[PDB]
C-alpha cells in the first residue's frame, strides 16, 4: 500500500471585504433584481442552483 | 515548509528524508526564502494606536478601545477546552483550533513523535473573573486562576 497526500499553497490568504464593501457581479445582481419579492421558492432554488 | 517559492519549496518537501537535507535543495529553498520570506516572529501593538488623523479620530478611537475590551472578553480562547500535548488553542470566534508543538502532529496534535518527552506536562491561563464590587478605596479587581 502507498498513500501520498500533498498540498501547495501559493496565495497564503485572500480576504474579501465584508458585504457592505463587496461589489456584486452584474449578472448575479441582475438575477437578484428579478427575484419575485415573495416566497416563490422556485426562483430562489434557481438562484441557489446557479 | 513555510516561505520560499513554489518550485524549491516543493522540491525540498519531496525529499524522502532518509538522508536529511539535500544541500542543493535546501540552499535553493533558502534563496527563495530570501525572495519570498514568511513571518517567523513579531512584536504586536494594538490596532487602536493607529486610528489617527481622521474625522472624530478620538471618539472612534475610544469607541474602538471599548469595543476591543468587549470583543476580547467575548472571544477569549479560555472558553476552549484544552489542547493535548501542550497544543495551544486559538478561537476563530466560533471554533477552537489547536496549534501544535514541533514533535507532535495530527490534526489536534494527538500523536507524538518517538522522541517526545515529559508527557502530560500542562499549564495555561484561565480567563479572568468578572470584576469585584468596589473596595474601600473604590477599586474593583479581577483574577485568573491558571486552571
Amino acid at each position: 500500500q502507498l498513500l501520498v497526500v500533498e498540498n501547495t499553497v501559493e496565495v497564503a490568504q485572500f480576504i474579501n471585504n465584508n458585504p457592505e464593501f463587496l461589489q456584486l457581479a452584474e449578472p448575479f445582481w441582475k438575477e437578484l433584481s428579478h427575484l419575485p419579492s415573495l416566497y416563490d421558492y422556485s426562483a430562489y432554488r434557481r438562484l441557489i442552483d446557479q | 515548509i513555510r516561505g520560499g517559492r513554489s518550485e524549491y519549496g516543493a522540491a525540498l518537501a519531496w525529499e524522502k528524508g532518509s538522508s536529511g537535507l539535500e544541500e542543493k535543495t535546501f540552499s535553493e529553498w533558502l534563496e527563495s526564502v530570501k525572495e519570498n520570506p514568511a513571518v517567523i516572529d513579531f512584536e504586536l501593538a494594538p490596532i487602536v494606536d493607529l486610528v489617527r488623523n481622521i474625522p472624530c479620530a478620538v471618539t472612534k478611537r475610544n469607541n474602538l478601545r471599548k469595543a476591543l475590551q468587549e470583543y476580547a472578553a467575548k472571544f477569549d480562547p479560555c472558553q476552549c477546552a484544552p489542547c493535548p500535548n501542550n497544543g495551544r488553542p486559538t478561537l476563530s470566534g466560533t471554533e477552537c483550533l489547536c496549534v501544535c508543538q514541533s514533535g507532535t502532529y495530527g490534526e489536534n496534535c494527538e500523536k507524538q513523535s518517538p522522541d517526545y518527552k515529559s508527557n502530560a506536562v500542562d499549564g495555561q491561563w484561565g480567563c479572568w473573573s468578572s470584576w469585584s464590587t468596589c473596595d474601600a478605596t473604590y477599586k474593583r479587581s479581577r483574577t485568573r486562576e491558571c486552571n
Binding site: 501559493e10 458585504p19 437578484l32 433584481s33 441557489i48 | 518550485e7 516543493a10
Partner: protein, 149 residues
C-alpha cells in the same frame, strides 16, 4: 511521481491555483442594492434552509463499509471507500486500517415546534444507522431551538 514532474506541477500551480481552503458566508448576506432588498434577503435565508432540507443526506439509508451517502437529485448514491464497489458498497474490501463497526448516523430533523413563546424547537434521533458494533456515536446535538419570525 518523478521529482521533476512534481516540481514542474508545483511551479505551474503558482499561475493556475485553485481554491483549496475557504471560510464561508451565507449568500443571503449579499442580497443588496435591489428593490425590496431587505425582504428578498429574508426570503433567501428561508430558501437556503429549504434547500438544505431538500438535500441533507439524512434522507439516505446507510451505505455499508463506511460508504458516504449523498443526495443526487431525487435519488441517493453511495460514495464507497476505495475498492469497495457496488450499489451499497457491499462488494470488495477496504484497503488500509479501520476501526470497523457501524458508525451512527443522524436521521433528518423534525419540523419545528410552533414558536412557543416565540421559540421554535426541533429534534433528531441518530437511528440511520444506530451506532453498532462499537462504531462511533453520531456527532452533534440532538435538538435545536431558535427565535420566531
Amino acid at each position: 511521481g518523478n521529482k521533476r514532474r512534481y516540481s514542474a506541477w508545483a511551479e505551474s500551480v503558482t499561475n493556475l491555483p485553485q481554491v483549496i481552503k475557504q471560510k464561508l458566508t451565507p449568500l443571503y448576506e449579499l442580497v443588496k442594492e435591489v428593490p425590496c432588498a431587505s425582504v428578498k434577503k429574508l426570503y433567501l435565508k428561508w430558501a437556503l434552509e429549504e434547500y438544505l432540507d431538500e438535500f441533507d443526506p439524512c434522507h439516505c439509508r446507510p451505505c455499508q463499509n463506511g460508504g458516504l451517502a449523498t443526495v443526487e437529485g431525487t435519488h441517493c448514491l453511495c460514495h464507497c471507500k476505495p475498492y469497495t464497489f457496488g450499489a451499497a458498497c457491499e462488494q470488495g474490501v477496504l484497503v488500509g486500517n479501520q476501526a470497523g463497526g457501524v458508525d451512527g448516523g443522524w436521521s433528518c430533523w423534525s419540523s419545528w415546534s410552533p414558536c412557543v413563546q416565540g421559540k421554535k424547537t426541533r429534534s433528531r434521533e441518530c437511528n440511520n444507522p444506530p451506532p453498532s458494533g462499537g462504531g462511533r456515536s453520531c456527532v452533534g446535538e440532538t435538538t435545536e431551538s431558535t427565535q420566531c419570525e
